[PDB]
PDB file of C-alpha atoms (C1' of nucleotides) in Angstrom:
ATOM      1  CA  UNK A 222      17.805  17.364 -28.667  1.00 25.89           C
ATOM      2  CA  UNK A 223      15.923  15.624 -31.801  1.00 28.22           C
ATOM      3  CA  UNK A 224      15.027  12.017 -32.034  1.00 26.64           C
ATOM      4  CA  UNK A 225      15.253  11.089 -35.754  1.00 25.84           C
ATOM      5  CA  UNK A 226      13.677   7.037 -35.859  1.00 25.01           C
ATOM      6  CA  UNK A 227      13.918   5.172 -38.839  1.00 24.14           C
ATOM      7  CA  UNK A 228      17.460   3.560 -40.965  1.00 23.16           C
ATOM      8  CA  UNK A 229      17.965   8.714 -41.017  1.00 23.61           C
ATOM      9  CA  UNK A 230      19.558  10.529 -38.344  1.00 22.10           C
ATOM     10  CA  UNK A 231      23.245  10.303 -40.013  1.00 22.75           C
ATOM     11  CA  UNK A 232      22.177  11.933 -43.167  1.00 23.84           C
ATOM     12  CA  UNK A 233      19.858  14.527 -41.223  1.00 26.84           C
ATOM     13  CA  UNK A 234      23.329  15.588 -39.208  1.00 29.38           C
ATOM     14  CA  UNK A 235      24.975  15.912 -42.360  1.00 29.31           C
ATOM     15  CA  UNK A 236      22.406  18.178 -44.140  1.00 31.82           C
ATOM     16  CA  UNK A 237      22.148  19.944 -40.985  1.00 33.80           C
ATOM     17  CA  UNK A 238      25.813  20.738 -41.213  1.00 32.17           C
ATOM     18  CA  UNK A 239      25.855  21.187 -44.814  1.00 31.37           C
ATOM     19  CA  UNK A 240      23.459  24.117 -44.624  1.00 33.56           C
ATOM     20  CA  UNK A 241      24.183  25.481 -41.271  1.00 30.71           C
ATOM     21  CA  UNK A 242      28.090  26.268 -42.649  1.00 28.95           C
ATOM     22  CA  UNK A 243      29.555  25.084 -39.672  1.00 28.86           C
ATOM     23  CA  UNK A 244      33.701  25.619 -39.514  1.00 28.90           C
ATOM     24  CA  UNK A 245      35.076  23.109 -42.024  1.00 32.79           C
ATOM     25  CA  UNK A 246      38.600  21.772 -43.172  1.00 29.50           C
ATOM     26  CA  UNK A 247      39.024  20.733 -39.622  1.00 26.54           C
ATOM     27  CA  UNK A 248      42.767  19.210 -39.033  1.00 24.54           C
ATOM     28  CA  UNK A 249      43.094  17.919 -35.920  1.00 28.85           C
ATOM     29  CA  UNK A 250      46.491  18.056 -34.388  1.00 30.64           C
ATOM     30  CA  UNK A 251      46.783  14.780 -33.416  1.00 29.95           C
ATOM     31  CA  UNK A 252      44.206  11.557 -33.570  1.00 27.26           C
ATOM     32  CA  UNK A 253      44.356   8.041 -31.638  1.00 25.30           C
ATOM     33  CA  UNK A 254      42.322   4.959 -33.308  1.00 24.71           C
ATOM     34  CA  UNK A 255      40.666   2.520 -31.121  1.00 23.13           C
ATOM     35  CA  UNK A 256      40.781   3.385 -27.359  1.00 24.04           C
ATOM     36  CA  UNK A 257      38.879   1.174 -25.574  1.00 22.36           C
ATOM     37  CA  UNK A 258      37.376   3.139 -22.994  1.00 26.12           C
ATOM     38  CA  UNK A 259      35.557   1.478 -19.437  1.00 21.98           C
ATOM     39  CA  UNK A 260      33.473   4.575 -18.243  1.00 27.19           C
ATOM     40  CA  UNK A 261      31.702   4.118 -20.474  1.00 27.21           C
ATOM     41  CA  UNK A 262      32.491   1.256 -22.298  1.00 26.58           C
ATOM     42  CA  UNK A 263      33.587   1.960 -26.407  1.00 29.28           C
ATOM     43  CA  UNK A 264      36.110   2.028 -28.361  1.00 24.77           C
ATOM     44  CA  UNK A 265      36.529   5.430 -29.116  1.00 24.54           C
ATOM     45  CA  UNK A 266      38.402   7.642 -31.634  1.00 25.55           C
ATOM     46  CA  UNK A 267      39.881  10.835 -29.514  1.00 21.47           C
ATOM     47  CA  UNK A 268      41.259  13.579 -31.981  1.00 21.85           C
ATOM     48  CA  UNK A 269      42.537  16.524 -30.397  1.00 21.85           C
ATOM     49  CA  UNK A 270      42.177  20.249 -31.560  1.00 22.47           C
ATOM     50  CA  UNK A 271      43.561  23.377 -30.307  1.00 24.47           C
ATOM     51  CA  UNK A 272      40.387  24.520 -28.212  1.00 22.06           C
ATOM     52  CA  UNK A 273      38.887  21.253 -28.203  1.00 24.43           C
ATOM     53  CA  UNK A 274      38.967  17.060 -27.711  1.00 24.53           C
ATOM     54  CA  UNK A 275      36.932  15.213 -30.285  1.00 23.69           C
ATOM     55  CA  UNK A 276      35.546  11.661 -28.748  1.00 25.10           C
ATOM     56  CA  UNK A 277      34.175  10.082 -32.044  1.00 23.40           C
ATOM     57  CA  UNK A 278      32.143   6.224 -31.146  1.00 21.51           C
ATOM     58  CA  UNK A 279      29.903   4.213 -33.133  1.00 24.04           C
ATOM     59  CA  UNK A 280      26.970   5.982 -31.455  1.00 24.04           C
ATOM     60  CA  UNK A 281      27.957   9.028 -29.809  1.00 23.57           C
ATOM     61  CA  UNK A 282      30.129  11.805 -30.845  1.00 25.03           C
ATOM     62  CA  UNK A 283      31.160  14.399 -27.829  1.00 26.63           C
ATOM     63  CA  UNK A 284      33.191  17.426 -28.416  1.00 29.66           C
ATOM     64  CA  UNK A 285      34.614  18.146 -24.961  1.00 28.43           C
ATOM     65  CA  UNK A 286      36.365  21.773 -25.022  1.00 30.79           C
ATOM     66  CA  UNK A 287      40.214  21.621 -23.115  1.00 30.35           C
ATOM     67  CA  UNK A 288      39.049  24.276 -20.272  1.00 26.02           C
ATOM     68  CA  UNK A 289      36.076  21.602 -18.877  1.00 28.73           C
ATOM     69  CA  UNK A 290      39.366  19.052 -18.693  1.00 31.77           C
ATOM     70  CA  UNK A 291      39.605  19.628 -14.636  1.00 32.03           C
ATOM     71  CA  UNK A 292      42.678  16.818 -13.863  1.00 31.31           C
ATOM     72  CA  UNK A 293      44.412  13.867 -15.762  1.00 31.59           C
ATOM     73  CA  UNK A 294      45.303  11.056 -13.964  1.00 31.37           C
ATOM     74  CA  UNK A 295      47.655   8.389 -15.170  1.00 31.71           C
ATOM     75  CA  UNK A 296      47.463   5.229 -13.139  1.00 33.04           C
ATOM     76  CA  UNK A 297      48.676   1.535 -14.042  1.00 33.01           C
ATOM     77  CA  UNK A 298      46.391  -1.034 -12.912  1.00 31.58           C
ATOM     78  CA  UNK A 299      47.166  -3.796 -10.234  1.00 33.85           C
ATOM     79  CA  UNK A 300      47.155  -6.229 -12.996  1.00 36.17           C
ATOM     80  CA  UNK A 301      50.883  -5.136 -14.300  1.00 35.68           C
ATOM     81  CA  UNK A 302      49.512  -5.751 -17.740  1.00 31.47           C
ATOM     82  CA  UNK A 303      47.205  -2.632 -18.116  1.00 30.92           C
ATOM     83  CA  UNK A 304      47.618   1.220 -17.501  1.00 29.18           C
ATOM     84  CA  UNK A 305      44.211   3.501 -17.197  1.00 30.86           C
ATOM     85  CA  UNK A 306      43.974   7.105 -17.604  1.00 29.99           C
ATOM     86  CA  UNK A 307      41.520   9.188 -16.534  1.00 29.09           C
ATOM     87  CA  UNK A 308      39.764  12.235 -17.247  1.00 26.92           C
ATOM     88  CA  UNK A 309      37.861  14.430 -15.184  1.00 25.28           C
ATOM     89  CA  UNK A 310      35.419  16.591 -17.011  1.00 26.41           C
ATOM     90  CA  UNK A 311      32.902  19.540 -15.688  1.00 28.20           C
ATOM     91  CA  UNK A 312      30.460  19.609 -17.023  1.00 27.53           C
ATOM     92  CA  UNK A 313      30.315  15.797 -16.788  1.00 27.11           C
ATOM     93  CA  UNK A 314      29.339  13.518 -20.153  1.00 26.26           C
ATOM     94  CA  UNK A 315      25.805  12.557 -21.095  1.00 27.13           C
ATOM     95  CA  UNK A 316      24.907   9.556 -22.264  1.00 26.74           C
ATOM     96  CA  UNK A 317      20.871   9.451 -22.692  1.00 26.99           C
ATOM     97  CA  UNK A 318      20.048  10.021 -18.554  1.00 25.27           C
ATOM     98  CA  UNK A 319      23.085   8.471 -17.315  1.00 28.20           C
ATOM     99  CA  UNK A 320      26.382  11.381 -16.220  1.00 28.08           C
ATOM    100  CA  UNK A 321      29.878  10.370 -16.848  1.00 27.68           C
ATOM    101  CA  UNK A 322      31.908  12.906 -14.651  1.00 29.22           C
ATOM    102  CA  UNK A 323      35.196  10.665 -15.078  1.00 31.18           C
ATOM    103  CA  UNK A 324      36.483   9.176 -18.406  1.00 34.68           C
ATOM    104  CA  UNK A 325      38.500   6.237 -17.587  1.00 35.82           C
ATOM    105  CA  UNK A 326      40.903   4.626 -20.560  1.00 36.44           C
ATOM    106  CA  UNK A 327      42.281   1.333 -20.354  1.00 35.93           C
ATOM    107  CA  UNK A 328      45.636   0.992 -22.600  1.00 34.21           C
ATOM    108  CA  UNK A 329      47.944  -2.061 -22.848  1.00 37.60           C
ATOM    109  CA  UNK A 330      51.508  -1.763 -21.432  1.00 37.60           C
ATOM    110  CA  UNK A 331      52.671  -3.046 -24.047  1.00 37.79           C
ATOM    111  CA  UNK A 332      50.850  -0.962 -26.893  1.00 37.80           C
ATOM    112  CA  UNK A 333      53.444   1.590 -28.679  1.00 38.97           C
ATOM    113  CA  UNK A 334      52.048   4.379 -30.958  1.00 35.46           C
ATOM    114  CA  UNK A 335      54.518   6.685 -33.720  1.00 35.54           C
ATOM    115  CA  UNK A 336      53.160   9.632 -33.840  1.00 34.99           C
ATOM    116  CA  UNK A 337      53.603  13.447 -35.897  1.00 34.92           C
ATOM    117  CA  UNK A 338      51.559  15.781 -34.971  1.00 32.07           C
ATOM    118  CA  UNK A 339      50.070  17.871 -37.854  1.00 34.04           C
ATOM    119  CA  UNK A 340      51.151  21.163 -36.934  1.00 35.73           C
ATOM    120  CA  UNK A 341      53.236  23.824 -39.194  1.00 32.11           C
ATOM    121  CA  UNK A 342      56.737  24.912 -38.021  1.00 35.96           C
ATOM    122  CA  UNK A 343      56.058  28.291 -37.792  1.00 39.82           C
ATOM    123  CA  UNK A 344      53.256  27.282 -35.405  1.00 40.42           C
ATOM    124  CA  UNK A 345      54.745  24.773 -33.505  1.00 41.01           C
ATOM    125  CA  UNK A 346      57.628  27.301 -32.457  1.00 41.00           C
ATOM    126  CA  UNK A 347      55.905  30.372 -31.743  1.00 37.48           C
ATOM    127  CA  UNK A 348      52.199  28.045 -29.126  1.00 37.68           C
ATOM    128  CA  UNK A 349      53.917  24.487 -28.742  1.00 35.43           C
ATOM    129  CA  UNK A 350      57.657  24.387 -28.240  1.00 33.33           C
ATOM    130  CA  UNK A 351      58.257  23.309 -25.076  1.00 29.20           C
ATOM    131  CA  UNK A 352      55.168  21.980 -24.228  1.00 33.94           C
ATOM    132  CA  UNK A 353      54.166  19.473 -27.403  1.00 31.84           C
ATOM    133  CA  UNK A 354      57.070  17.255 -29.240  1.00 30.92           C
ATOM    134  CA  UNK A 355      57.074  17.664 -32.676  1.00 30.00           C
ATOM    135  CA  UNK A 356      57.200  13.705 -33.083  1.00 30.45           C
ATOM    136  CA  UNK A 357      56.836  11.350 -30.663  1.00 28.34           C
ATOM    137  CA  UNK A 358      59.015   8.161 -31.336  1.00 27.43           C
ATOM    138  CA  UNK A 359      57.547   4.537 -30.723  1.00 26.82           C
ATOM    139  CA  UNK A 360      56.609   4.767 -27.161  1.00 27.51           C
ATOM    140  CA  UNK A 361      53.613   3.385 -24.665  1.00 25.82           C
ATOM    141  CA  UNK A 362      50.202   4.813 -26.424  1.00 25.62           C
ATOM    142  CA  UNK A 363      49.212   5.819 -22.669  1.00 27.88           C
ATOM    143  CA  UNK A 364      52.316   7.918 -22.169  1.00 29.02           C
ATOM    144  CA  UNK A 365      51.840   9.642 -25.768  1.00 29.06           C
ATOM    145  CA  UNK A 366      48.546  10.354 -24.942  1.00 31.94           C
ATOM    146  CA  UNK A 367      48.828  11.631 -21.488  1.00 30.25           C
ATOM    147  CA  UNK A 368      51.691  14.524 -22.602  1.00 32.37           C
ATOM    148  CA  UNK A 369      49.663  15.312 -25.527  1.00 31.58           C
ATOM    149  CA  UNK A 370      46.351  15.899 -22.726  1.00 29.30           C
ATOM    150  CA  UNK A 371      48.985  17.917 -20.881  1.00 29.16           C
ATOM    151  CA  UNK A 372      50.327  20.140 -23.844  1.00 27.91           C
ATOM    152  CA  UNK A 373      46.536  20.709 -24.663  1.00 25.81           C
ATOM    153  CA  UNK A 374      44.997  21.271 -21.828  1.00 25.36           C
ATOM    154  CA  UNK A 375      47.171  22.930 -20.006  1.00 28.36           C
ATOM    155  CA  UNK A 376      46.470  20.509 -16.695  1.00 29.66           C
ATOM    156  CA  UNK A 377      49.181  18.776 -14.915  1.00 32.55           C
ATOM    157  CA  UNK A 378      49.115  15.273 -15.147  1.00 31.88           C
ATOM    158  CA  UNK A 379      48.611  12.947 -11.991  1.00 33.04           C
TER     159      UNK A 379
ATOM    160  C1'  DA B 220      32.717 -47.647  69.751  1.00 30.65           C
ATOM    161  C1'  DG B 221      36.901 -49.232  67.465  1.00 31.72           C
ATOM    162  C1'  DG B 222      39.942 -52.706  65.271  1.00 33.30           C
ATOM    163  C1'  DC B 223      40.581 -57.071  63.070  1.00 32.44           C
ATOM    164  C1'  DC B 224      39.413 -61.763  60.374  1.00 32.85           C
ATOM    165  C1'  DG B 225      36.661 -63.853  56.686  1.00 31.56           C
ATOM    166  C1'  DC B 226      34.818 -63.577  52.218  1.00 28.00           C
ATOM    167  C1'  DT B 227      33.384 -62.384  47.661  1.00 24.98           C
ATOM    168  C1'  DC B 228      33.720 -60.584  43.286  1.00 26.23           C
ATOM    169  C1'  DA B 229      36.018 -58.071  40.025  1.00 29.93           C
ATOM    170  C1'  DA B 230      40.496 -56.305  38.376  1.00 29.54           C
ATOM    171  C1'  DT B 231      44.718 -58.165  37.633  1.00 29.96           C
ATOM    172  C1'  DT B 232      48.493 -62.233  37.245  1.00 29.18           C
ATOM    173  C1'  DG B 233      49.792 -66.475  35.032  1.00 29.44           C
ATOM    174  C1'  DG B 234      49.884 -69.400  31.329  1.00 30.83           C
ATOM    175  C1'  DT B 235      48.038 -71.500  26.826  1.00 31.14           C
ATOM    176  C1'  DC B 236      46.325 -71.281  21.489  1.00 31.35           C
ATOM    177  C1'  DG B 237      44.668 -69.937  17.259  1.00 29.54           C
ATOM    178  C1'  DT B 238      44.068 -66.634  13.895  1.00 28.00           C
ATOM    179  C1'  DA B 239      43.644 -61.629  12.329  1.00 28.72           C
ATOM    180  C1'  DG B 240      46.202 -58.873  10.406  1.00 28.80           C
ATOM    181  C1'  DA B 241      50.842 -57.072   9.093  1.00 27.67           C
ATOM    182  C1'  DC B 242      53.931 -57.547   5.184  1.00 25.58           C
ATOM    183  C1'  DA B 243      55.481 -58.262   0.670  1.00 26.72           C
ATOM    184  C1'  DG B 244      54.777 -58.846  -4.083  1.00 25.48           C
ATOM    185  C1'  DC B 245      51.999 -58.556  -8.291  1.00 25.89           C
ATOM    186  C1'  DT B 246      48.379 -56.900 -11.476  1.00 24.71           C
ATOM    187  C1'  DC B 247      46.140 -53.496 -14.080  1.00 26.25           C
ATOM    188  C1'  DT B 248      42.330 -50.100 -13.734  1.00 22.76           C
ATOM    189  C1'  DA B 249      41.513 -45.638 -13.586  1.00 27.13           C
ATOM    190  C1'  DG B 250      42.929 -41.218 -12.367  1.00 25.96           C
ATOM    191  C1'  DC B 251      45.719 -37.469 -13.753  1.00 23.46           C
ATOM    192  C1'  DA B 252      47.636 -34.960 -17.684  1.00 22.41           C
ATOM    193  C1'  DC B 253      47.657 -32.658 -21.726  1.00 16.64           C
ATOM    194  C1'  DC B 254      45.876 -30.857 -26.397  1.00 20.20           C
ATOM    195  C1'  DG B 255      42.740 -29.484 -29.975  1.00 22.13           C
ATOM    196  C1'  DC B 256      38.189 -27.791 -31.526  1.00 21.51           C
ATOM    197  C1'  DT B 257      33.215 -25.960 -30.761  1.00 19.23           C
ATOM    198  C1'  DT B 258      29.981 -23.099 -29.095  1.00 15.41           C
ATOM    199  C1'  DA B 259      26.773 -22.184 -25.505  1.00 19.13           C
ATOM    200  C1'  DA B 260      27.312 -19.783 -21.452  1.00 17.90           C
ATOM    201  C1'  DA B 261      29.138 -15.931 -18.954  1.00 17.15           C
ATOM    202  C1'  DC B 262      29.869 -11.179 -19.008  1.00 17.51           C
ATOM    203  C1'  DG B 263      29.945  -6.187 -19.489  1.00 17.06           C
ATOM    204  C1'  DC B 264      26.733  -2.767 -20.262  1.00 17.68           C
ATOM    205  C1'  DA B 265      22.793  -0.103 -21.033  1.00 18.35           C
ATOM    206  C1'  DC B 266      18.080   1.095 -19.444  1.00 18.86           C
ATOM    207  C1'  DG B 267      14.058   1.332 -16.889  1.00 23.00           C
ATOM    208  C1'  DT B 268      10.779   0.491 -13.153  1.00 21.93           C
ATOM    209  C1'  DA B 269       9.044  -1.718  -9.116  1.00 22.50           C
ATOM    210  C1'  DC B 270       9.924  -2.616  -4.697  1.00 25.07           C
ATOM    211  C1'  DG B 271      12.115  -1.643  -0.459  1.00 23.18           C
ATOM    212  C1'  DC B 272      12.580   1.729   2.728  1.00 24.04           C
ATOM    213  C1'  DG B 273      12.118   6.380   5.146  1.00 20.54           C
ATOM    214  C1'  DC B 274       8.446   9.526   6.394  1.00 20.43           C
ATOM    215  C1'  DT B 275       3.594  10.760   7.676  1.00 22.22           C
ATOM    216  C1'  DG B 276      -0.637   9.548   9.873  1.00 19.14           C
ATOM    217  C1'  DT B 277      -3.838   7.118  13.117  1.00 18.46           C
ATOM    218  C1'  DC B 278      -4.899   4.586  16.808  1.00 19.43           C
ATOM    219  C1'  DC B 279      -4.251   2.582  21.606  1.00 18.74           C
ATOM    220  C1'  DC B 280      -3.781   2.945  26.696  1.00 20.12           C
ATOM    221  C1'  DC B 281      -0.933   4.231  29.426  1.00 20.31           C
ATOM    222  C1'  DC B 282       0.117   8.964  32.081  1.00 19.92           C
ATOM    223  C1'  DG B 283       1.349  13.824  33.713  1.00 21.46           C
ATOM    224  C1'  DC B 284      -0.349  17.716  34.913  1.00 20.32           C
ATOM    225  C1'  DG B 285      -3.783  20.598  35.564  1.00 22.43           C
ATOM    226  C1'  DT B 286      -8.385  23.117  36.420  1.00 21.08           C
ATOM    227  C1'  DT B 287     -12.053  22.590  38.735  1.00 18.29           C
ATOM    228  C1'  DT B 288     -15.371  21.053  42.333  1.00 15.68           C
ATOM    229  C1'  DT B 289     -17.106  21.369  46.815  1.00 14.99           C
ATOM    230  C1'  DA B 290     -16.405  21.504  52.233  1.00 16.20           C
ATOM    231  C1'  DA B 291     -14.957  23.107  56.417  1.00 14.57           C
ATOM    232  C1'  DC B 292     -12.644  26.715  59.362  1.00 16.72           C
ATOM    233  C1'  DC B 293     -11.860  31.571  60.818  1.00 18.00           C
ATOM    234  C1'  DT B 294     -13.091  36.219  61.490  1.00 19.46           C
ATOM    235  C1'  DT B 295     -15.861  40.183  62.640  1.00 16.42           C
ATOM    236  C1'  DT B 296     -19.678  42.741  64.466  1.00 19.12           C
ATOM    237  C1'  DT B 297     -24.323  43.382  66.590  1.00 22.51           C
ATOM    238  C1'  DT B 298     -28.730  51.913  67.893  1.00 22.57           C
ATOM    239  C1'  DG B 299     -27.905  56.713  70.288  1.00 21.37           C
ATOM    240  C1'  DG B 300     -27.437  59.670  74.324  1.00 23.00           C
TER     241       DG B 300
END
DNA sequence: AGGCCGCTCAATTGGTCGTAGACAGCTCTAGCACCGCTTAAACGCACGTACGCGCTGTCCCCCGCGTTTTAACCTTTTTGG
């Protein structure tokens, strides 16, 4: 771990993955815009890979791979106006000294997501069929989310 | 001693008066009620360190438990032929 001062770092993470030819054209499968997370706190992009779960914020990215996904819970809150889900990782998050071995999302109710995943057909049939839809029609964002953590990951959903 | 009459003073009976307060009716203030707009305050969160607390150490003055100090009682024997 480097700490880059000065407004530098960005542009230093760019170079560095310019010139270190990391694996590029990336296409995630699926992506979800704003999730307001609690543990910790940020609105979060998530954008999900075959091997992998992408958690892009305005000041830290994690790449968390699908076997350290232990359990998924999916919980509505006492409130009747909110539904959390939760994600146990191992090894847990870092966030500077501070360990995040839970990942709890906080989705409205009422919040409804359309969503095609970006998969070919020939792909879809032969790793996904059964497990993935190939849409998902306007339903809860939290419910969405949750089968495409279980499709993914492989972990049954609590 | 024991029981009964007189009395005295304080609670209660009897009767008398004046007003304190109940009742009604009226006014109108202010208390509730809502609505819109602003923004400082609250809040969620992150981060770090200082302070609270558990552990170690030292001292006091009680004590258990022991080794040691010193005294008194018992035992044995007093040439050979």
């Amino acid at each position: 771990r480097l700490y880059v001062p000065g407004q530098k770092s960005q542009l230093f993470y760019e170079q560095l993955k310019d010139k270190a030819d990391f694996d590029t054209t990336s296409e995630a499968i699926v992506s979800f815009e704003d999730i307001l997370f609690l543990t910790p706190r940020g609105r979060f992009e998530i954008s999900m890979y075959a091997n992998n779960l992408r958690l892009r914020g305005q000041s830290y990215d994690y790449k968390i791979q699908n076997k350290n996904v232990l359990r998924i819970f999916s919980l509505p809150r006492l409130d009747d106006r909110h539904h959390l889900v939760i994600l146990q990782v191992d090894p847990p998050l870092r966030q500077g000294q501070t360990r995040y071995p839970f990942l709890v999302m906080q989705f409205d109710r009422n919040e409804e997501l359309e969503v095609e995943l970006n998969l070919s057909d020939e792909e879809y049939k032969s790793k996904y069929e059964g497990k993935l839809n190939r849409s998902y029609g306007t339903d809860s964002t939290y419910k969405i989310l949750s089968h495409c953590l279980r499709g993914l990951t492989e972990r049954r959903v609590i």
